[PDB]
RNA sequence: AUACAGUGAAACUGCGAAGCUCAUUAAAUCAGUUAUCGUUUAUUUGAUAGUUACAUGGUAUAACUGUGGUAAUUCUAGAGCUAAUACAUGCAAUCUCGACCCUUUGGAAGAGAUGUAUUUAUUAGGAUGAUUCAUAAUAACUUUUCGAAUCGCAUGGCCUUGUGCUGGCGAUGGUUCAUUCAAAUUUCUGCCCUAUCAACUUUCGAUGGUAGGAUAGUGGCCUACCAUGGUUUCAACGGGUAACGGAGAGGGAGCCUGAGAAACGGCUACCACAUCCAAGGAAGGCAGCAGGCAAUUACCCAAUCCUAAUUCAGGGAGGUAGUAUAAAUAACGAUACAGGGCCCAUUCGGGUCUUGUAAUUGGAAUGAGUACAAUGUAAAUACCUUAACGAGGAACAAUUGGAGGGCAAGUCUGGUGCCAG
């Protein structure tokens, strides 16, 4: 047949899953950000490790190198577009200062809770998974969607959603129908 | 209210018709049928229904918009003479063999 | 400087008339 | 092949010419299940549409050629794009210096070539 | 339609029929390139033939009618028909030298000349760098070729009213040349280790010459004579290899068609296999294919292309369909009733405050399902989109593993009552 394909994993199991500090670390990260499992924490730790390893490798290179300059500035430009790094930390050492909590804060479910659209992180997740949240014009039901700044302000309730201006849901109209009958 | 937008209107004399891109805006509704779009297109172009062909309509993701491509033949006889047999069968101009 | 050398390198990698433009003109005339 | 992604964004900031940004919601591939569409893959799709408009007919993807053009292109996404900007070009190793270097035959080789350049 | 005239079974003609499975091979495969003035070439394209006829025959039969044999086949004999783009036959012009220089474009006495194809001999000789090349002529030769006895549509111009003369657009045929589609030889170049592979070749041609046979053709390709040559330590010859990095259609032999094949076609003789039968004979290439150590099927020529008496017909070429990843299992309030909840500490105990319900209750949201449609598409499945219904045990009832309990008019065992296991 024809050529095979390259695909890879988005996460890696920790070196030791069983030290207690780790366990309660996933406990509070999950509880505060309202995740489903530790799989997402291993995911996010995986990319944070990749980013910090690249940043460290770029630090090892001497100042003004084509390599260090080009790729370091590209790390930081993209890390500021994602909103993780602020405009005033336009430096790679501050990339090395990063933590998982910032990425998790960039997850859409955090914003849906956070802006006031939802009153609990689990309620925010329910609203997202239930076709009530629109980033701009487009409906997202993935809590793991990470938000940009321009995308951060454009989080609203869906035109099709009952709370955003559409007709009442099945339950409301059913109750109204039985009340009329 | 459906709105039908026709762009890149290229008059093809050799096949004796006009070819174009049809963009259909249908807010708050599923989509517009090809008989339905043919009715509108022939109304717009002052041509018979048998002389109008429409196909390849893909709804843009998120809904509310579709894009397909359409033909308006100069005559119904020319439409029968040049159109594919299967498209003629779709519109009823030809019987399935 | 490094950016310019890349552009100059790119321009090196990359009577006057375009075959597509002639086609587009027939397409436009038909239009 | 010569193009190195990280270099051309510097052109973008230094071009001083606008960039034709798309809508916030129009970029997400599929309800968010596929992350925000990267800049490059938006450049590939418009080739299809700019290709599709002229041909007058869509292009179907062969069942074979299908099997090496979506997954890895949406798994490089899941490996490498987190929010429509790629984190993958860096774990990769490339000699960008050749792309920066004035390797062409028109290169400073003797003292007189560079002196003529300085003129 | 008084020859027939639309359509049209059968038959005769014309065109075309050109995936698999085994083995394995170092520049002998293959890739690039050069030459064919050494060559064949269906088809495409363009040119190219003045040398009984108001239309000859069965020297002809199929299909078809009718009579029979056979166990029997794409097995058969007798008798009787009828056609061709099948088979054989075949038919009062033009140009020159031009007196008279008659008229001075011009007429004109007379003299003359006049296919193609094969082979041989001879004579002359625009093209290329180069030719015995192209071409022309002469004398003959040939199982001497070809030089429309063919078909559709229309019925025009003339007159000498006779259906008299003269005619428009096509198809199918035909000689030669060129062109194109190819093919066959063919120049030079092209990354493994190698001498623990040093001679190899003449080993029923090895190197070359002359003549012949074969061949589209050159050529030891083959044959008769003649000379002993040809490669090689600059690696000949031989060996190994991740050199998947060319062969057959039961096995060998011979033959037939076609422009193109030594044909996945057919024929003959053998060598074996094997089927049927009335045991008198007939026929097969399955000695296959696909599987297991088990559903490969159903729908199409539309999309890109391919072959034909061709737009239209077909193609198991081809296409269509069949059979590790992100979510949900819930979110939000109100009320009632209770005083305990928990951490740390081998040890004793110490530290700390809104906690528990195995209580009641209210209104919202939506996904799986139940599904009306359109779209989609050769059609169809699918995808996208989209009416109605759809949750409190939300029974619309995910699992897996581990750690502790406690209970009897219950059972067993051991002991120092009422214990211990």
UniProtKB/Swiss-Prot annotation, chain A:
Name residues in a coiled coil.
Answer: none
Q: What name does this protein carry?
A: Small ribosomal subunit protein uS4A
NCBIfam families (UniProt xref)? PRK04051.1 (NF003139), uS4_arch (TIGR01018)
One GO cellular component this record assigns the protein to is: cytosolic small ribosomal subunit
UniProt GO BP: maturation of SSU-rRNA from tricistronic rRNA transcript (SSU-rRNA, 5.8S rRNA, LSU-rRNA); ribosomal small subunit biogenesis; translation
Which UniProt keywords are present, listed alphabetically? Cytoplasm, Isopeptide bond, Nucleus, Phosphoprotein, Ribonucleoprotein, Ribosomal protein, Ribosome biogenesis, RNA-binding, rRNA processing, rRNA-binding, Ubl conjugation
Q: Which organism is it from?
A: Saccharomyces cerevisiae (strain ATCC 204508 / S288c) (Baker's yeast)
Other facts? Present with 106000 molecules/cell in log phase SD medium.
Where does this polypeptide localize? Cytoplasm; Nucleus, Nucleolus
Q: Pinpoint the Glycyl lysine isopeptide (Lys-Gly) (interchain with G-Cter in ubiquitin) cross-link.
A: 179
> Which superkingdom heads the taxonomic lineage of this protein's source?
Eukaryota
Q: Name one GO molecular function term.
A: structural constituent of ribosome
Q: Which InterPro entries match?
A: Ribosomal_uS4, Ribosomal_uS4_CS, Ribosomal_uS4_euk/arc, Ribosomal_uS4_N, S4_RNA-bd, S4_RNA-bd_sf
Concerning its family, UniProt says:
Belongs to the universal ribosomal protein uS4 family.
Gene3D superfamilies under this entry? RNA-binding S4 domain
Curated annotation (Swiss-Prot), chain B:
Keywords in alphabetical order, please.
Acetylation, Cytoplasm, Isopeptide bond, Phosphoprotein, Ribonucleoprotein, Ribosomal protein, Ubl conjugation
* Principal location listed in the UniProt entry: cytoplasm
| GO BP field | cytoplasmic translation; maturation of SSU-rRNA from tricistronic rRNA transcript (SSU-rRNA, 5.8S rRNA, LSU-rRNA)
PTM: N-terminally acetylated by acetyltransferase NatA. Also partially acetylated by NatC.
Subunit relationships: Component of the small ribosomal subunit (SSU). Mature yeast ribosomes consist of a small (40S) and a large (60S) subunit. The 40S small subunit contains 1 molecule of ribosomal RNA (18S rRNA) and 33 different proteins (encoded by 57 genes). The large 60S subunit contains 3 rRNA molecules (25S, 5.8S and 5S rRNA) and 46 different proteins (encoded by 81 genes).
Family, according to the entry, reads as follows: Belongs to the eukaryotic ribosomal protein eS24 family.
Additional facts recorded: There are 2 genes for eS24 in yeast.
List the protein's name.
Answer: Small ribosomal subunit protein eS24A
Organism of origin is: Saccharomyces cerevisiae (strain ATCC 204508 / S288c) (Baker's yeast)
Task: Tell which residues of the whole protein are contained here.
Answer: 4 to 100 of 135
UniProtKB/Swiss-Prot annotation, chain C:
Q: Where in the cell is it found?
A: Nucleus, Nucleolus
Other remarks in the entry: Present with 5130 molecules/cell in log phase SD medium.
Q: What family does this belong to?
A: Belongs to the WD repeat RRP9 family.
Free-text domain note? The WD domains are required for nucleolar localization and U3 small nucleolar RNAs binding.
Subunit organization: Interacts with UTP25. Component of the ribosomal small subunit (SSU) processome composed of at least 40 protein subunits and snoRNA U3.
Record function comment: Involved in nucleolar processing of pre-18S ribosomal RNA. Required for efficient pre-rRNA cleavage at sites A0, A1 and A2, and biosynthesis of 18S rRNA.
Q: What is this protein called?
A: Ribosomal RNA-processing protein 9
Tell me the lineage of the source organism.
Eukaryota, Fungi, Dikarya, Ascomycota, Saccharomycotina
Q: Which residues of the full protein are shown?
A: 65 to 121 of 573
Curated annotation (Swiss-Prot), chain D:
Q: Where is this region: Disordered?
A: 63-119
Q: What does this protein do?
A: Component of the U3 small nucleolar ribonucleoprotein. Required for the early cleavages at sites A0, A1 and A2 of the pre-ribosomal RNA. Participates in ribosome biogenesis.
Identify the species of origin: Saccharomyces cerevisiae (strain ATCC 204508 / S288c) (Baker's yeast)
* Protein name (Swiss-Prot/TrEMBL): U3 small nucleolar ribonucleoprotein protein LCP5
Leftover remarks: Present with 1430 molecules/cell in log phase SD medium.
> In which compartments does the protein localize?
Nucleus, Nucleolus
Q: Which gene encodes it?
A: LCP5
Mark out the compositionally biased spans (Basic and acidic residues).
110-119
């Amino acid at each position: 047949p024809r050529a095979p394909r390259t695909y890879s994993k988005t996460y890696s199991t920790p070196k030791r899953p069983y030290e207690s500090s780790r366990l309660d670390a996933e406990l509070k990260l999950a509880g505060e950000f309202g995740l489903k499992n530790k799989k997402e924490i291993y995911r996010i730790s995986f990319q944070l490790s990749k980013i910090r390893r690249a940043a460290r490798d770029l630090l090892t290179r001497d100042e003004k190198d084509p390599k260090r300059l080009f790729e370091g500035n590209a790390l930081i430009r993209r890390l500021v577009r994602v909103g993780v790094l602020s405009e005033d930390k336009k430096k790679l050492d501050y990339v090395l200062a990063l933590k998982v909590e910032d990425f998790l804060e960039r997850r859409l479910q955090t914003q849906v809770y956070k802006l006031g659209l939802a009153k609990s992180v689990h309620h925010a997740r329910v609203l997202i998974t239930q076709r009530h949240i629109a980033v701009g014009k487009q409906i997202v039901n993935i809590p793991s969607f990470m938000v940009r700044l321009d995308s951060e302000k454009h989080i609203d309730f869906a035109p099709t959603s009952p709370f955003g201006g559409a007709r009442p849901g099945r339950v409301a109209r059913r109750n109204a129908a039985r009340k009329a009958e | 209210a459906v709105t039908i937008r026709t762009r890149k209107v290229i008059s093809n004399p050799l096949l004796a018709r006009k070819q174009f891109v049809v963009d259909v805006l249908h807010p708050n509704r599923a989509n517009v049928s090809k008989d339905e779009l043919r009715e509108k297109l022939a109304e717009v172009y002052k041509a018979e229904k048998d002389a109008v062909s429409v196909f390849g309509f893909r709804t843009q993701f998120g809904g509310g918009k579709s894009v397909g491509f359409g033909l308006v033949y100069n005559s119904v006889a020319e439409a029968k003479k040049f159109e594919p047999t299967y498209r003629l069968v779709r519109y009823g101009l030809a019987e399935k063999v | 400087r490094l950016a310019k050398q890349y552009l100059e390198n790119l321009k090196s990698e990359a009577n006057n008339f375009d075959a597509g433009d002639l086609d587009k003109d027939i397409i436009a005339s038909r239009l | 092949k010569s193009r190195m992604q990280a270099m051309e964004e510097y052109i973008r900031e230094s071009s001083d010419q606008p960039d034709w940004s798309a809508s916030i919601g129009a970029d997400i591939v599929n309800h968010g299940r596929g992350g925000i569409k990267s800049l490059r893959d938006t450049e590939k799709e418009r080739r299809v549409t700019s290709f599709e408009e002229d041909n007058f007919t869509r292009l179907n993807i062969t069942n074979k050629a299908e099997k090496r053009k979506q997954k890895q292109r949406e798994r490089n996404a899941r490996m490498n794009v987190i929010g429509g900007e790629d984190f993958g070009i860096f774990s990769s190793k490339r000699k960008l210096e050749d792309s920066t270097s004035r390797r062409g035959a028109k290169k400073t080789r003797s003292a007189w070539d560079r002196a003529q350049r300085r003129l």
